[PDB]
Coordinates of C-alpha atoms and ligand atoms in Angstrom, one line a residue:
Chain A
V1 CA 33.4 -64.7 13.6
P2 CA 34.4 -64.3 10.3
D3 CA 36.3 -67.3 10.5
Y4 CA 33.0 -69.2 10.3
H5 CA 30.8 -66.6 8.1
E6 CA 30.5 -68.7 5.6
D7 CA 30.1 -72.3 6.8
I8 CA 27.4 -71.1 8.9
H9 CA 25.2 -69.3 6.9
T10 CA 25.4 -72.2 4.4
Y11 CA 24.7 -74.4 7.5
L12 CA 21.4 -71.9 8.0
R13 CA 20.3 -72.7 4.5
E14 CA 20.3 -76.3 4.9
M15 CA 18.6 -75.8 8.1
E16 CA 15.5 -73.9 7.2
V17 CA 14.8 -75.3 4.5
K18 CA 14.7 -79.1 6.9
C19 CA 12.5 -76.7 9.5
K20 CA 10.0 -74.9 6.9
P21 CA 6.1 -75.1 8.1
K22 CA 4.1 -77.3 5.6
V23 CA 2.8 -73.9 3.3
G24 CA -0.3 -75.0 3.1
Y25 CA -1.4 -76.2 6.8
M26 CA -4.3 -73.3 7.8
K27 CA -6.5 -75.2 4.9
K28 CA -6.5 -78.6 6.3
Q29 CA -7.1 -77.4 10.6
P30 CA -10.8 -77.4 10.7
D31 CA -11.0 -75.1 13.9
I32 CA -8.2 -72.1 13.3
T33 CA -7.8 -69.8 10.6
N34 CA -5.0 -66.8 9.3
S35 CA -6.9 -64.2 11.9
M36 CA -6.7 -67.0 14.7
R37 CA -2.8 -67.6 14.1
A38 CA -2.2 -63.5 14.1
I39 CA -4.1 -63.2 17.4
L40 CA -1.8 -65.2 19.2
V41 CA 1.9 -63.9 17.8
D42 CA 0.2 -60.4 18.3
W43 CA 0.1 -61.6 22.0
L44 CA 3.3 -62.9 21.9
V45 CA 4.7 -60.2 20.8
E46 CA 3.5 -58.8 23.7
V47 CA 4.3 -61.6 26.3
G48 CA 7.6 -60.7 25.2
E49 CA 7.8 -57.3 26.2
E50 CA 5.7 -57.6 28.7
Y51 CA 9.3 -60.7 29.5
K52 CA 11.5 -58.1 28.0
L53 CA 12.8 -61.7 26.2
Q54 CA 14.9 -61.3 22.7
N55 CA 13.4 -60.9 19.5
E56 CA 14.4 -64.7 18.4
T57 CA 12.9 -66.3 21.3
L58 CA 9.9 -64.5 19.1
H59 CA 10.8 -66.0 16.2
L60 CA 11.8 -68.8 17.6
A61 CA 8.5 -69.3 19.0
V62 CA 6.8 -69.1 15.6
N63 CA 8.6 -71.8 14.2
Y64 CA 8.1 -73.9 16.6
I65 CA 3.7 -72.6 16.8
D66 CA 3.7 -72.9 12.5
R67 CA 5.7 -76.8 13.0
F68 CA 3.6 -78.5 15.3
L69 CA 0.3 -77.5 13.0
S70 CA 1.4 -78.6 10.4
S71 CA 1.0 -82.6 12.0
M72 CA -1.3 -82.1 15.4
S73 CA -5.2 -80.5 14.1
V74 CA -6.0 -77.7 17.3
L75 CA -8.6 -76.8 18.6
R76 CA -9.5 -72.8 19.2
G77 CA -9.4 -73.4 22.7
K78 CA -6.2 -74.6 22.9
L79 CA -4.4 -72.6 20.5
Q80 CA -2.8 -70.7 23.0
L81 CA -1.8 -73.2 25.4
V82 CA 0.8 -74.3 22.3
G83 CA 1.7 -71.2 22.5
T84 CA 2.5 -71.0 25.4
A85 CA 4.4 -74.1 25.8
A86 CA 6.5 -73.0 22.5
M87 CA 7.4 -69.7 24.1
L88 CA 8.3 -72.0 27.1
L89 CA 10.5 -74.0 25.5
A90 CA 11.7 -71.1 23.2
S91 CA 12.8 -68.9 26.2
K92 CA 14.3 -72.2 27.7
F93 CA 16.5 -72.5 24.6
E94 CA 17.0 -68.7 23.4
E95 CA 17.3 -66.2 26.4
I96 CA 19.6 -66.9 29.7
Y97 CA 16.9 -66.2 32.2
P98 CA 14.2 -67.5 30.7
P99 CA 11.1 -66.7 32.4
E100 CA 9.1 -69.5 35.4
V101 CA 6.6 -71.9 34.1
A102 CA 4.4 -69.3 37.0
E103 CA 4.9 -67.3 34.6
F104 CA 3.4 -68.5 31.1
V105 CA 1.1 -70.2 33.0
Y106 CA -0.5 -66.2 35.2
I107 CA 0.3 -64.6 31.4
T108 CA -2.6 -66.9 29.8
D109 CA -4.6 -65.6 32.9
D110 CA -5.0 -68.9 34.2
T111 CA -6.9 -70.5 31.5
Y112 CA -4.9 -73.4 31.3
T113 CA -3.3 -74.8 34.2
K114 CA 0.6 -76.0 34.9
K115 CA 0.5 -79.1 34.8
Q116 CA -1.4 -78.5 30.8
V117 CA 1.5 -76.3 30.2
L118 CA 4.1 -79.1 31.6
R119 CA 2.0 -81.5 29.4
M120 CA 2.6 -79.3 26.3
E121 CA 5.8 -78.6 26.8
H122 CA 6.3 -82.4 26.5
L123 CA 3.8 -83.2 23.6
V124 CA 5.8 -79.7 21.1
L125 CA 9.1 -81.7 22.3
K126 CA 7.7 -84.9 20.8
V127 CA 6.3 -83.5 17.5
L128 CA 9.2 -81.2 16.9
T129 CA 11.7 -84.2 18.0
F130 CA 13.8 -82.3 19.5
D131 CA 14.4 -80.2 16.5
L132 CA 14.8 -76.4 18.5
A133 CA 18.0 -74.6 16.5
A134 CA 15.7 -73.7 14.1
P135 CA 16.9 -70.6 11.3
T136 CA 15.2 -67.3 11.6
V137 CA 14.3 -64.3 9.7
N138 CA 16.9 -62.8 12.3
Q139 CA 19.8 -64.9 12.4
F140 CA 19.6 -63.7 8.0
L141 CA 19.0 -59.9 8.9
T142 CA 22.1 -59.8 11.8
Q143 CA 24.6 -61.2 8.8
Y144 CA 23.0 -59.4 6.6
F145 CA 23.3 -56.3 8.7
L146 CA 27.4 -56.9 8.3
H147 CA 27.0 -56.0 4.2
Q148 CA 26.1 -52.4 5.8
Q149 CA 28.4 -49.4 4.0
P150 CA 28.6 -47.4 6.9
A151 CA 26.4 -49.8 10.0
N152 CA 23.0 -47.8 10.3
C153 CA 20.8 -48.6 13.7
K154 CA 17.7 -47.2 11.6
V155 CA 18.1 -49.9 8.9
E156 CA 18.6 -52.3 11.8
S157 CA 16.3 -51.9 13.4
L158 CA 13.2 -50.8 10.9
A159 CA 14.2 -54.8 8.9
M160 CA 13.6 -56.2 12.4
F161 CA 10.3 -54.3 12.6
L162 CA 9.6 -55.2 9.0
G163 CA 10.7 -59.1 9.3
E164 CA 8.3 -59.5 12.7
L165 CA 5.5 -58.0 10.9
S166 CA 5.5 -61.3 8.7
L167 CA 5.2 -63.4 11.9
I168 CA 1.5 -62.2 12.0
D169 CA 0.8 -63.3 8.6
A170 CA 0.7 -66.8 7.3
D171 CA -0.8 -65.5 4.2
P172 CA 1.4 -65.2 2.5
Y173 CA 4.1 -65.3 4.3
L174 CA 4.1 -69.2 4.6
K175 CA 5.3 -69.4 1.6
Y176 CA 8.8 -67.7 1.7
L177 CA 11.8 -69.0 3.6
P178 CA 13.8 -67.1 6.3
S179 CA 16.4 -65.7 4.8
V180 CA 14.1 -64.8 2.0
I181 CA 12.1 -62.6 4.4
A182 CA 15.3 -60.9 5.4
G183 CA 16.6 -60.4 1.7
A184 CA 13.2 -58.1 1.6
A185 CA 13.6 -56.1 4.8
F186 CA 16.7 -55.5 5.0
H187 CA 16.3 -54.7 1.9
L188 CA 13.4 -52.8 1.9
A189 CA 14.9 -51.0 5.3
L190 CA 17.7 -49.9 3.7
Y191 CA 15.6 -48.3 0.6
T192 CA 13.8 -46.6 3.2
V193 CA 16.2 -44.5 5.5
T194 CA 19.0 -44.2 3.2
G195 CA 17.5 -44.9 -0.6
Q196 CA 19.9 -47.7 -1.8
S197 CA 19.6 -50.5 -2.7
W198 CA 20.2 -54.5 -1.7
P199 CA 24.2 -54.7 -2.1
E200 CA 26.2 -56.2 -4.5
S201 CA 28.4 -58.0 -1.5
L202 CA 24.8 -60.3 -0.6
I203 CA 24.2 -60.9 -4.1
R204 CA 28.2 -62.7 -4.1
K205 CA 27.1 -64.0 -0.1
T206 CA 23.2 -65.6 -0.6
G207 CA 23.0 -65.4 -4.3
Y208 CA 19.7 -63.8 -3.6
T209 CA 19.6 -59.8 -6.3
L210 CA 16.5 -57.2 -6.3
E211 CA 14.3 -59.9 -8.7
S212 CA 14.6 -63.5 -6.8
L213 CA 13.1 -61.4 -4.1
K214 CA 10.8 -59.4 -5.6
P215 CA 8.2 -61.7 -5.3
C216 CA 8.4 -61.7 -1.7
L217 CA 9.1 -57.5 -1.5
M218 CA 6.0 -56.8 -4.0
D219 CA 4.1 -58.8 0.0
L220 CA 6.2 -57.0 2.4
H221 CA 6.5 -53.5 0.5
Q222 CA 1.8 -53.6 1.0
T223 CA 2.4 -55.1 4.8
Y224 CA 4.7 -52.2 5.4
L225 CA 2.2 -49.2 3.1
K226 CA -1.2 -51.5 5.6
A227 CA 0.6 -51.8 9.0
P228 CA -1.0 -49.2 10.4
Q229 CA -4.6 -50.2 9.2
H230 CA -4.0 -54.1 11.2
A231 CA -6.0 -55.1 13.6
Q232 CA -3.3 -56.6 15.3
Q233 CA -0.8 -53.3 16.5
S234 CA 1.5 -54.9 18.7
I235 CA 4.6 -54.7 17.0
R236 CA 4.4 -51.3 16.1
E237 CA 3.9 -50.4 19.0
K238 CA 6.6 -52.5 20.3
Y239 CA 8.1 -50.3 17.7
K240 CA 7.9 -47.2 18.9
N241 CA 10.3 -47.8 21.8
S242 CA 14.0 -46.2 21.2
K243 CA 15.5 -49.5 22.4
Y244 CA 13.9 -49.7 18.1
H245 CA 14.5 -46.5 17.5
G246 CA 11.7 -45.4 16.4
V247 CA 11.5 -47.4 13.4
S248 CA 7.6 -47.7 13.1
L249 CA 7.0 -44.0 13.1
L250 CA 9.6 -43.6 10.1
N251 CA 7.2 -43.4 6.6
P252 CA 7.3 -46.4 3.9
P253 CA 8.0 -45.6 0.4
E254 CA 4.9 -45.2 -1.7
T255 CA 6.9 -46.5 -4.4
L256 CA 10.2 -49.1 -5.0
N257 CA 10.9 -48.6 -8.0
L258 CA 12.1 -51.8 -9.1
Chain B
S1 CA 12.0 -98.3 24.7
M2 CA 13.8 -99.6 27.8
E3 CA 13.0 -103.0 27.7
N4 CA 15.4 -103.9 25.0
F5 CA 18.0 -102.4 27.0
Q6 CA 20.3 -104.1 30.2
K7 CA 21.8 -102.0 32.3
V8 CA 25.3 -103.2 33.1
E9 CA 26.9 -100.6 36.0
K10 CA 27.0 -96.6 36.6
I11 CA 30.0 -95.2 34.7
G12 CA 29.3 -91.1 35.5
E13 CA 26.9 -88.5 36.6
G14 CA 25.3 -84.8 35.9
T15 CA 23.1 -82.8 38.0
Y16 CA 20.0 -84.4 36.8
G17 CA 20.9 -87.7 37.0
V18 CA 23.6 -90.4 36.5
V19 CA 24.8 -91.9 33.6
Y20 CA 24.6 -95.5 33.3
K21 CA 27.2 -98.5 30.9
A22 CA 23.7 -101.0 29.5
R23 CA 23.8 -103.3 26.3
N24 CA 21.1 -103.0 23.6
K25 CA 19.6 -106.4 24.4
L26 CA 18.9 -107.6 20.8
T27 CA 21.8 -105.9 18.8
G28 CA 25.0 -106.1 21.6
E29 CA 25.5 -102.3 21.0
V30 CA 27.0 -101.1 24.6
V31 CA 25.8 -97.6 25.4
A32 CA 25.5 -94.8 27.4
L33 CA 22.1 -94.2 29.1
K34 CA 21.7 -90.1 30.1
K35 CA 19.2 -90.8 33.1
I36 CA 17.5 -86.5 32.7
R37 CA 14.5 -86.4 35.5
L38 CA 11.7 -84.7 34.6
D39 CA 9.2 -83.8 37.7
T40 CA 5.6 -83.0 37.0
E41 CA 5.4 -80.0 38.6
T42 CA 8.2 -77.6 39.1
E43 CA 9.5 -76.6 35.7
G44 CA 9.4 -78.8 33.2
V45 CA 12.3 -80.3 30.5
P46 CA 15.6 -78.9 31.7
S47 CA 17.0 -75.9 29.6
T48 CA 20.6 -77.8 29.6
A49 CA 18.7 -80.7 28.3
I50 CA 16.7 -79.6 26.1
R51 CA 19.8 -77.7 24.4
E52 CA 22.4 -80.8 24.5
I53 CA 19.2 -83.1 23.2
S54 CA 18.3 -80.3 20.2
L55 CA 22.4 -79.4 19.0
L56 CA 23.7 -83.0 19.4
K57 CA 21.0 -83.6 16.7
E58 CA 22.1 -81.5 14.2
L59 CA 26.2 -82.6 15.7
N60 CA 26.6 -85.7 13.7
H61 CA 30.6 -86.1 13.7
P62 CA 33.5 -89.4 14.4
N63 CA 34.8 -86.3 17.7
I64 CA 31.5 -85.6 19.3
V65 CA 29.3 -88.1 21.6
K66 CA 26.3 -89.8 19.2
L67 CA 23.1 -90.0 20.2
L68 CA 21.4 -92.3 19.5
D69 CA 17.8 -91.9 20.5
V70 CA 16.2 -90.4 23.4
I71 CA 13.7 -92.2 25.7
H72 CA 10.7 -91.2 27.6
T73 CA 10.2 -93.2 29.9
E74 CA 6.8 -92.8 32.0
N75 CA 8.5 -89.2 33.8
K76 CA 11.9 -89.8 33.1
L77 CA 14.2 -88.7 30.0
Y78 CA 16.7 -91.2 28.8
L79 CA 19.4 -89.9 25.8
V80 CA 21.2 -93.6 24.5
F81 CA 24.2 -92.0 24.2
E82 CA 27.4 -94.6 22.2
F83 CA 29.9 -96.1 24.8
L84 CA 32.7 -94.6 25.0
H85 CA 35.4 -96.3 27.4
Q86 CA 36.9 -93.4 29.6
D87 CA 37.5 -89.4 29.7
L88 CA 40.5 -87.2 28.8
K89 CA 41.1 -86.8 32.9
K90 CA 41.6 -90.7 34.2
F91 CA 43.7 -91.3 31.5
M92 CA 46.5 -88.6 32.3
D93 CA 45.9 -90.3 35.6
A94 CA 46.6 -93.3 34.4
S95 CA 49.1 -91.9 32.3
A96 CA 51.0 -90.7 35.8
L97 CA 53.7 -92.9 35.4
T98 CA 54.8 -91.9 32.2
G99 CA 53.5 -89.5 30.3
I100 CA 51.2 -89.6 27.1
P101 CA 53.1 -90.7 24.2
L102 CA 53.3 -87.5 22.1
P103 CA 51.7 -89.5 18.9
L104 CA 49.1 -90.0 21.2
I105 CA 49.1 -85.8 22.3
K106 CA 48.8 -84.6 18.4
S107 CA 46.6 -87.4 18.0
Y108 CA 43.9 -86.4 20.8
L109 CA 44.8 -82.7 19.8
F110 CA 44.0 -83.3 16.0
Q111 CA 40.6 -84.9 16.9
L112 CA 39.5 -82.0 19.6
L113 CA 40.1 -79.3 16.4
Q114 CA 38.4 -81.1 13.7
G115 CA 35.6 -81.7 16.5
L116 CA 35.5 -78.5 17.6
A117 CA 35.8 -76.7 14.1
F118 CA 32.7 -79.0 13.2
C119 CA 30.3 -77.7 16.0
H120 CA 31.8 -74.1 15.4
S121 CA 31.1 -74.6 11.9
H122 CA 27.6 -75.4 13.2
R123 CA 27.0 -72.5 15.7
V124 CA 27.3 -74.7 18.0
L125 CA 29.7 -73.3 21.4
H126 CA 30.8 -76.1 23.9
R127 CA 31.7 -73.7 26.8
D128 CA 33.2 -76.7 29.6
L129 CA 35.6 -78.0 27.1
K130 CA 37.9 -79.8 29.7
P131 CA 39.2 -83.0 30.2
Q132 CA 36.3 -84.7 32.1
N133 CA 33.9 -83.8 29.0
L134 CA 36.5 -85.7 26.8
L135 CA 35.5 -88.9 25.8
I136 CA 38.3 -91.7 24.1
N137 CA 37.7 -94.8 23.4
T138 CA 40.2 -98.3 23.0
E139 CA 40.8 -97.0 18.6
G140 CA 42.4 -94.3 18.8
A141 CA 39.6 -91.9 18.7
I142 CA 38.9 -89.2 21.3
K143 CA 34.9 -87.3 21.6
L144 CA 33.9 -83.8 22.4
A145 CA 30.8 -84.5 24.9
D146 CA 28.5 -82.8 27.6
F147 CA 26.8 -80.6 25.3
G148 CA 24.2 -79.2 28.5
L149 CA 25.9 -76.2 29.0
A150 CA 26.3 -75.9 24.8
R151 CA 24.4 -72.8 23.0
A152 CA 23.4 -72.1 19.3
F153 CA 24.9 -68.9 18.6
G154 CA 24.0 -65.8 16.1
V155 CA 27.0 -63.9 13.6
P156 CA 27.4 -61.5 15.1
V157 CA 27.5 -62.9 19.0
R158 CA 25.3 -61.2 21.0
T159 CA 25.8 -61.4 25.0
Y160 CA 25.0 -64.7 26.7
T161 CA 25.1 -66.5 30.2
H162 CA 28.5 -65.0 31.8
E163 CA 30.9 -67.0 33.7
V164 CA 30.1 -69.9 31.4
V165 CA 33.1 -72.5 31.8
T166 CA 35.0 -74.6 34.4
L167 CA 37.2 -71.7 36.2
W168 CA 40.3 -73.5 35.0
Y169 CA 39.4 -73.9 31.9
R170 CA 38.5 -70.2 31.3
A171 CA 39.5 -67.4 28.7
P172 CA 40.1 -64.4 30.0
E173 CA 37.6 -62.3 27.7
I174 CA 35.0 -64.2 30.3
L175 CA 36.9 -63.2 33.7
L176 CA 37.2 -59.5 32.7
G177 CA 33.1 -59.6 31.6
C178 CA 33.4 -59.0 28.1
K179 CA 30.0 -57.9 26.8
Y180 CA 30.8 -60.2 23.8
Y181 CA 32.5 -64.2 23.6
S182 CA 32.5 -66.1 20.4
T183 CA 34.1 -69.4 19.5
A184 CA 37.5 -67.9 20.5
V185 CA 36.8 -69.5 23.9
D186 CA 36.6 -73.1 23.3
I187 CA 40.3 -73.1 22.0
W188 CA 41.3 -71.9 25.1
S189 CA 40.1 -74.5 26.6
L190 CA 41.4 -76.4 23.9
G191 CA 45.0 -74.3 24.7
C192 CA 44.9 -74.9 28.3
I193 CA 43.8 -79.6 27.6
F194 CA 46.8 -78.9 24.9
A195 CA 49.4 -78.0 28.2
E196 CA 47.6 -80.4 30.1
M197 CA 47.9 -83.5 28.3
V198 CA 51.8 -82.7 27.9
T199 CA 52.4 -81.6 32.2
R200 CA 50.0 -84.2 33.1
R201 CA 48.7 -81.1 35.8
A202 CA 46.0 -78.5 34.8
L203 CA 48.0 -75.4 33.4
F204 CA 45.9 -72.4 35.6
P205 CA 44.8 -73.8 38.3
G206 CA 43.1 -70.9 40.0
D207 CA 40.1 -70.8 43.2
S208 CA 38.3 -67.9 42.2
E209 CA 38.5 -65.5 38.8
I210 CA 41.1 -63.3 40.3
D211 CA 43.2 -66.3 41.3
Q212 CA 42.9 -67.4 37.9
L213 CA 43.4 -64.0 36.0
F214 CA 46.1 -63.6 38.0
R215 CA 47.6 -66.9 37.5
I216 CA 47.4 -66.3 33.4
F217 CA 48.7 -63.0 33.7
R218 CA 52.2 -64.2 35.2
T219 CA 52.2 -67.1 32.7
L220 CA 51.3 -65.2 29.6
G221 CA 52.6 -61.5 31.0
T222 CA 49.8 -58.4 31.8
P223 CA 48.0 -57.7 28.6
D224 CA 48.0 -54.4 27.6
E225 CA 46.3 -52.1 24.3
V226 CA 49.3 -53.5 21.9
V227 CA 48.8 -57.0 23.3
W228 CA 45.0 -56.8 23.5
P229 CA 43.6 -53.4 22.1
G230 CA 40.3 -52.8 24.4
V231 CA 42.1 -54.9 27.6
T232 CA 41.7 -51.6 29.6
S233 CA 38.4 -50.7 28.7
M234 CA 36.5 -54.2 29.5
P235 CA 33.7 -54.5 32.6
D236 CA 36.3 -55.9 34.8
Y237 CA 39.7 -54.9 34.3
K238 CA 41.5 -52.7 36.7
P239 CA 44.3 -50.9 36.4
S240 CA 45.5 -52.0 39.8
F241 CA 46.1 -55.4 38.5
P242 CA 49.6 -56.0 39.0
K243 CA 52.4 -56.0 35.7
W244 CA 53.9 -59.2 35.2
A245 CA 56.2 -59.6 32.1
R246 CA 55.2 -62.5 29.5
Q247 CA 57.5 -66.1 29.9
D248 CA 59.8 -67.1 27.0
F249 CA 57.2 -69.4 26.6
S250 CA 59.3 -72.7 25.7
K251 CA 59.4 -72.7 30.0
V252 CA 55.4 -73.2 30.0
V253 CA 55.3 -76.6 28.9
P254 CA 58.9 -77.1 28.6
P255 CA 58.7 -81.0 26.5
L256 CA 57.3 -78.5 23.5
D257 CA 59.0 -78.4 20.7
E258 CA 58.9 -75.5 18.6
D259 CA 56.3 -76.9 16.3
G260 CA 54.0 -77.5 19.4
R261 CA 55.3 -74.2 21.2
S262 CA 54.2 -72.4 18.4
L263 CA 50.8 -73.5 18.0
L264 CA 50.0 -73.6 21.5
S265 CA 50.9 -69.5 22.1
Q266 CA 48.2 -69.3 18.8
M267 CA 45.5 -71.3 21.2
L268 CA 47.0 -69.0 24.1
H269 CA 46.6 -65.6 22.9
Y270 CA 45.3 -62.6 24.6
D271 CA 43.0 -61.1 21.3
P272 CA 39.9 -63.1 21.0
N273 CA 40.5 -62.2 17.1
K274 CA 44.1 -63.2 16.8
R275 CA 43.5 -66.5 18.8
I276 CA 43.4 -68.9 15.9
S277 CA 40.2 -70.7 14.8
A278 CA 40.1 -74.6 15.3
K279 CA 39.6 -74.2 11.5
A280 CA 43.3 -72.7 11.1
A281 CA 44.6 -74.9 13.3
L282 CA 44.5 -78.1 12.0
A283 CA 46.4 -77.0 9.1
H284 CA 49.2 -76.5 11.8
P285 CA 52.7 -77.8 11.1
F286 CA 52.7 -79.3 14.1
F287 CA 50.3 -81.7 12.5
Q288 CA 52.5 -82.8 9.5
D289 CA 53.3 -86.3 10.6
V290 CA 49.5 -87.1 12.8
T291 CA 48.8 -90.4 13.0
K292 CA 45.2 -91.7 15.2
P293 CA 47.4 -94.8 17.6
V294 CA 45.5 -97.1 19.6
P295 CA 46.0 -96.3 23.3
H296 CA 49.1 -96.6 25.1
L297 CA 47.2 -98.5 28.2
Ligands
LIG301 BR1 30.8 -93.3 28.7 C1 30.0 -91.1 29.2 C2 28.9 -91.0 27.8 BR2 28.9 -92.1 26.5 C3 28.9 -89.6 28.2 BR3 27.2 -89.5 26.5 C4 28.4 -89.6 29.5 N1 27.7 -88.0 30.5 N2 28.4 -88.0 30.8 N3 29.0 -89.1 31.2 C5 28.9 -89.8 30.9 C6 29.9 -90.9 30.4 BR4 30.7 -91.8 31.4

């Protein structure tokens, strides 16, 4: 709580740089593309909904995938196996009650065996050298939420919605750090719902201004406006639920006036 | 590589294997090897091992047991740890004669608090601070060990696993089924350990959750809305709970001086919000004359 707020934020700002995937890895993957990655992440959203997993678990799994794919060339028919092992690892790390391995085998419609999943689990842990406590967009968002006055459930849900959308598109979001995406997502959410802007108190905390967030914000605002048309729709569907205050039905602003 | 290690003897055990004292044949370094059985079928790498390794890899601190390496040798995990000589429970038993010298209790509490503050500053809850998980060496160091039950928390926290912490060291907010618990649970545990180091017996040795709560209530008073706003609304609070008066705090740990008593009471505060942080405790007057003496045994 309050005694460690600053220490922890500082620490996560250090770790997010250390846990960043390489911006350019997809260029170096012969057999997979940003679009195939988009498909995988969209499926992971569905898995998360099927098993009622935390959003944090989804964010971690994506972080593990992008890091693994930064080191390891992977064939298209194996991408889903990587994804499944990452989501298993994320669940064991993050969830009170992770789904059993059999449940992960099942969700791949028996494309892979239990033995494959388990072997990939170990390989992923080796490639990542067990470094699983990665900062996510989510972890920064929940800290930023403490700087609302007053707290607004639609702002929070919408910011999470937007942060989650950025997981789908390697281009361009791979080049932004979690704390920066969270900054853009939080300002955008706040602006859409209440008309307010990135608060002074978060400039003091993060050192980010609307100016430093602009490029990410410009990208996020486009993603927002184009979300109904995106080939991947699982996040929009997920965020229609009242658990998330139906924020995907809110209208994006046509301009940010920045 | 396993080849470079010579096993000496067994020194402990966990859920997924025993722990061996071993020595590096090349450097001479004495180490502890924590065996984690993996099984090709079943469930793969146990989440407790996944959490212990990944959290320990971030936690480099003189008062946290150092994970040196992780060895996968054909379907088991060996965690290579710095060797420590015994656990605090064994040392208290060995000190059943006369107590532990106060300079040493103070040194141990101060070091425990340093290790814990480091954990909490790095968003890690330990969740099983008990004397058996606190390791001492011959130079006067004490270190937090066994991070199998730990987890990385978020700010603010969400609901995590219930009924955590070995019962005797479990905080009232866990016992009362609160939706949220945080760093203050580890402080409660250290508070119980502080008391235990002085008396050499457990402060609240309950055998069930309700028994644990009642022992706490009889020592510190049954909490009302004055002492702990929200208590009566907590999921496992019951209005039929007996209403015990709060004891003269000098009677809880009679050998304690004014400063020690002050510090203990802030560690055993009912309201998690008011309970002292490990960070704030390091500057308590109790520690004004702290040194780090070698263990007397
Ligand atoms: Br010494 C030692 C060390 Br070092 C570690 Br690590 C342990 N984990 N369980 N039991 C342990 C013992 Br005994």
